[PDB]
């Protein structure tokens, strides 16, 4: 399975992830490639933010779907 991550700025990137694998795994890959903490980055889809502890299967995400990237604003 493959999915494209779209950054708020405007950049889509291919990202292969097993349906069984939870979101946490996806964030891990994103961190290694892009270099951004999982907690910091937040994905959005179907009017719902993806939780870092749920299998993609439940979400029933379409093949090669685009995920909206949203970086949490610093508390300071």
């Amino acid at each position: 399975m493959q999915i494209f991550v779209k950054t708020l700025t405007g950049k889509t990137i291919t990202l292969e992830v097993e349906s069984s694998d939870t979101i946490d795994n996806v964030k891990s890959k994103i961190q290694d490639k892009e270099g951004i903490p999982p907690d910091q980055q937040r994905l959005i889809f179907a009017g719902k933010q993806l939780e870092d502890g749920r299998t993609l299967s439940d979400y029933n995400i379409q093949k090669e779907s685009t995920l909206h990237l949203v970086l949490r604003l610093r508390g300071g």
Partner: peptide, 24 residues
Amino acid sequence: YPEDEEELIRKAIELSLKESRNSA
């Protein structure tokens, strides 16, 4: 509003919903 992060999150929420109009 001093919550650019929150608005941004929903902004993306609406944008995505528009595309996934056909329940996908």
